Design a protein around this ligand. Structure first.
Ligand SMILES: NC(=O)c1ccc[n+]([C@@H]2O[C@H](COP(=O)([O-])OP(=O)(O)OC[C@H]3O[C@@H](n4cnc5c(N)ncnc54)[C@H](O)[C@@H]3O)[C@@H](O)[C@H]2O)c1
Ligand SMILES: NC(=O)c1ccc[n+]([C@@H]2O[C@H](COP(=O)([O-])OP(=O)(O)OC[C@H]3O[C@@H](n4cnc5c(N)ncnc54)[C@H](O)[C@@H]3O)[C@@H](O)[C@H]2O)c1
Ligand SMILES: CC(=O)N[C@H]1[C@@H](OP(=O)(O)OP(=O)(O)OC[C@H]2O[C@@H](n3ccc(=O)[nH]c3=O)[C@H](O)[C@@H]2O)O[C@H](CO)[C@H](O)[C@@H]1O
Ligand SMILES: CC(=O)N[C@H]1[C@@H](OP(=O)(O)OP(=O)(O)OC[C@H]2O[C@@H](n3ccc(=O)[nH]c3=O)[C@H](O)[C@@H]2O)O[C@H](CO)[C@H](O)[C@@H]1O
Lengths: 341, 341
C-alpha cells in the first residue's frame, strides 16, 4: 500500500512534536523546515548564517501558512557555542543536525575552519542534545566517507580512506556518535547523504555545488567547467528523498538506532550526463544554451565514483525515495530560473 | 653490532639539529627534552601547563649540563592557538608532538575539553609544521585505537571500534595525518604508544596513570584499587623505549613515512602481576607495604587486553627496545620514593 513515510506524513499532524534543525537557514535545513512546518510540527532552528541565508527563511515563510510559520522559533547562534546548543535543544523531541561547512575544496583550502564547525560543533550538539534528554538525534553524515574505496555500489560497513579534511570531519561525526551510544547510552542515526540537490541550494560563492553552479552558469550564458573527463559519477539525491530520510530516522524504532545509512537513490549519473540533463532541462523551460563544456583538471580531494546501495535504509527505516535525478532536475530548474530573474 | 638508535645517538651530537617538543613540560615531553639536550641538540618547547609542570622543566635542568640547558628555548603557549604553533615551529627541523590531554576517564567526564586540545590542537600543529617546512613530524598516537578488537597481539592495519572520546581523538590524529600527506604532501609518522611509564609521570591528580598512582599509594600506605578482576593486561613501555622510537621516527627514511607504528615491548602484564611487581620493587628499596589490593568495578571506556606486535617498527624504523617492565620498574621506584620524600 503506502510507504512508511507516507504513513508518517499522516500521523505527524495528528500528534505534533518539537523538532530542532541546526543549519536551518541553509539548503537542506530550510527544506526540512518547510516540510515540518507544513506537517503542523513545532520547530526550533539554529544557524549563524556562515553559509546559510535569511532569504531562505523568508522563502519558507512565503511558502507556508501564517499559522504554520508561528510554530517556528529561530535562534541566530553557533553550534561551536555550547550555550547556543543548550538553548536550542531545550524541550526538543527530535534533533536533525544539519549545521556544518560543506565543500571538499573549502576544507582543503582551510581545514581549521571546517574542523571547528564540523567536529567541535558536532560534539557540542551531541552533549547538549544528550543533556536535554531529546528523544532522537539524527545528523548529516557524508558519502565521501567511502573515500578511495573503488567497489560499487557502496555498502555501509565497507568504507575507504578519506581524501580530504572535510571527509575526515564527517567520518569523525560517526565516530563520536558511536562512542556516545556506548558511553552514555545516547543513541543516534547518521545519514550518509549522496550529493543532495534541489531548491535553495546556493548557486553563488566559490564553493557552490555542481548543479547550482552549472544551472546558474547556463542561465547566464557563461562557460561550464567539468573537472576531469566528466566520467566522474554521483548518486544525485533530490532534496525530497533526503527530507524523507530525516523524518524517518527521527521517528525510527530502537532497532534502527546507532546506525548509519546511505541516503540516495541508487542511480549512477556521470558529470557528462548531468551537463546535458541540466541543459535540456533548462531548454524545456525556454532557456537556451549552446556552449560545449570546458574540461579542466580533476579537483583535489575528489571521489571518482559514488553509487549507493540503499537496502539498509529501505529495510530498517522503510526508506523509499520517489525522485530520480530527472524528476528532481525538472522540479529544480524553474526555481533557479526564477532565482536569477 | 649496534642498533640503529645506538648509531643515531652517536651521529646526532656530531651534527646538531633543531627539535620542537610540544607538551615538553609533561611526562613524555620532559623525558624527550632530557634525552635531546644530553645529545647536544637544540630544542624548542611548547606547553600551557594544563597537566604538565614547571617542576618537570626544573628537574631536567638539574639533570643536564649548563651548556645543554642553554640549547633549550621554552614557549608557554597553547597548541589550540595557531599563533603559538607558528612561533614554536619557526626554524625547526623535527617536530615531536606530545601535547595533549591523556586519560580515558577524563575524556568520558568531559569530552569537549579533550576534543579541543587533542583534535583542534593537533590540526593546528600539522598546519603550522607544514607551513614552517619542517623536515619531519612525529606525533603521539595511542594503542587505545585498537578499541574493542579482541585479537592478540595487535597489528597496525587491524583496529577496532573506539571505546572512549579520548580513543576517538587519537584515532582522528591518524586520520588527519594521512590526509595531510595525500593533500599537501606533508609526511608524518604516528606512534601508537602502549602505556608508557617512568620518571616524571604524575602520581597526583584524579587522572593519574596506574603505575604512578599505585606506587605513590603504596609509598603512602593507602589502599590500592584494581578496576575489575585485575586480569586486564597491558604492554607497559618504559619511557626510554618511547624516547628511542621518537628520535628514530624523526630521522627515518622516506619509506618509513606516512606510517603509524606500535611502540611497546611486546610483553603482557596483567594488573595483578603489576601490583606485586610494584610492591616487591618498593620493598627492594626499603619500602614495605602489606595491604592486599581492593578490587572494584571495571572502569568505563577501558580496553581489556593490550599486547603489541612491534615487528613493523623494528623492520622499518629499526626499533629495538631494551627495557622490559621489571627493569623499568627498578629504575622508576627510586624516583617516586624521592618524589614523595
Ligand atoms: N549538500 C549535500 O549534498 C550534502 C551531502 C552530505 C552531507 N551534507 C551535509 O548536510 C548539511 C547541510 O548541508 P547543506 O547542503 O544544506 O549546506 P548549506 O551550507 O546550504 O547549509 C549549512 C548551514 O549550516 C550553517 N552553519 C554552518 N556552520 C554553522 C555553525 N558553526 N553554527 C551554526 N550554523 C552553522 C550554515 O549557515 C548553513 O545555513 C551539512 O552538515 C553537510 O555536511 C550535505
Ligand atoms: N602516557 C602514555 O602511556 C601515553 C600513551 C599513548 C599516547 N600518549 C600521548 O603522549 C602524549 C603525552 O602524554 P604524557 O603521558 O607525557 O602526559 P602529560 O599530561 O604528563 O603530558 C601532556 C603535556 O601536554 C601539555 N598540554 C596539554 N594540552 C596542551 C595544549 N592544549 N597546549 C599546550 N600544551 C598542552 C600538558 O601541559 C602536559 O605537559 C599525549 O599526546 C598522550 O595522548 C601517552
Ligand atoms: C561522493 C562525495 O564525496 N560527495 C560529497 C562531496 O560532494 P561533491 O564534492 O562530490 O559535490 P560537488 O557538487 O561540489 O562536485 C560534484 C562533482 O562535480 C565536479 N564539478 C564541480 C563544480 C564545477 O564547476 N565543475 C565540476 O566538474 C566536482 O569536481 C565533483 O567531481 O562533498 C559534499 C559536501 O559538500 C557531500 O558530502 C557529498 O556527499
Ligand atoms: C590500551 C589502552 O587503551 N591504553 C591507553 C589508555 O591508557 P590506560 O587507561 O590503559 O592507562 P591507565 O594507567 O589510566 O590504566 C591502566 C589500567 O589500570 C587500571 N587502574 C587504574 C588506576 C587505578 O587506581 N586502578 C586500576 O585498576 C585501569 O582501569 C586500566 O585498566 O589511555 C592512555 C592515555 O591516558 C594511553 O593512550 C594508553 O595507550
Amino acid at each position: 500500500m503506502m510507504s512508511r513515510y507516507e504513513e508518517l506524513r499522516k500521523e505527524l499532524p495528528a500528534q505534533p512534536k518539537v523538532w530542532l534543525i541546526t543549519g536551518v537557514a541553509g539548503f537542506i535545513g530550510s527544506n526540512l523546515l518547510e516540510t515540518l512546518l507544513k506537517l503542523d510540527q513545532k520547530v526550533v532552528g539554529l544557524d549563524n548564517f556562515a553559509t546559510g541565508h535569511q532569504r531562505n527563511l523568508d522563502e519558507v515563510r512565503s511558502l507556508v501558512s501564517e499559522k504554520q510559520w508561528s510554530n517556528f522559533k529561530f535562534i541566530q547562534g553557533d553550534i561551536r557555542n555550547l550555550d547556543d546548543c543548550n538553548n536550542a535543544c531545550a524541550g526538543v523531541d527530535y534533533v536533525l543536525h544539519q549545521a556544518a561547512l560543506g565543500s571538499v575544496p573549502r576544507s582543503i583550502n582551510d581545514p581549521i575552519t571546517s574542523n571547528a564547525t564540523n567536529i567541535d560543533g558536532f560534539l557540542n550538539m551531541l552533549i547538549a542534545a544528550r543533556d536535554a534528554k531529546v528523544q532522537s538525534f539524527t545528523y548529516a553524515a557524508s558519502s565521501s566517507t567511502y573515500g578511495d574505496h573503488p567497489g560499487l555500489p557502496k555498502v555501509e560497513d565497507t568504507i575507504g580512506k578519506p581524501l580530504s579534511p572535510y571527509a575526515v570531519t564527517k567520518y569523525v561525526n560517526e565516530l563520536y556518535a558511536d562512542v556516545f551510544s556506548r558511553c552514555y547510552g545516547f543513541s543516534t542515526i547518521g545519514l550518509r547523504y549522496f550529493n543532495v540537490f534541489g531548491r535553495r541550494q546556493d548557486p553563488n560563492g566559490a564553493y557552490a555545488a555542481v548543479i547550482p553552479k552549472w544551472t546558474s552558469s547556463m542561465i547566464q550564458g557563461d562557460d561550464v567547467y567539468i573537472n576531469g573527463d566528466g566520467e566522474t559519477s554521483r548518486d544525485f539525491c533530490y532534496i525530497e528523498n533526503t527530507v524523507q530520510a530525516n523524518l524517518l530516522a527521527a521517528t525510527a524504532g530502537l532497532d534502527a538506532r546507532n546506525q548509519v545509512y546511505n541516503i540516495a537513490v541508487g542511480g549512477r549519473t556521470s558529470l557528462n550526463q548531468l551537463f546535458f540533463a541540466l541543459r535540456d532541462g533548462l531548454a524545456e523551460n525556454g532557456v537556451s544554451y549552446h556552449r560545449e563544456p570546458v574540461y579542466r583538471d580533476f579537483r583535489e580531494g575528489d571521489v571518482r565514483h559514488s553509487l549507493a546501495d540503499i537496502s539498509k535504509a529501505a529495510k530498517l527505516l522503510g526508506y523509499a525515495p520517489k525522485y530520480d535525478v530527472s524528476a528532481g532536475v525538472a522540479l529544480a530548474m524553474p526555481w533557479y530560473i526564477m532565482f536569477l530573474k
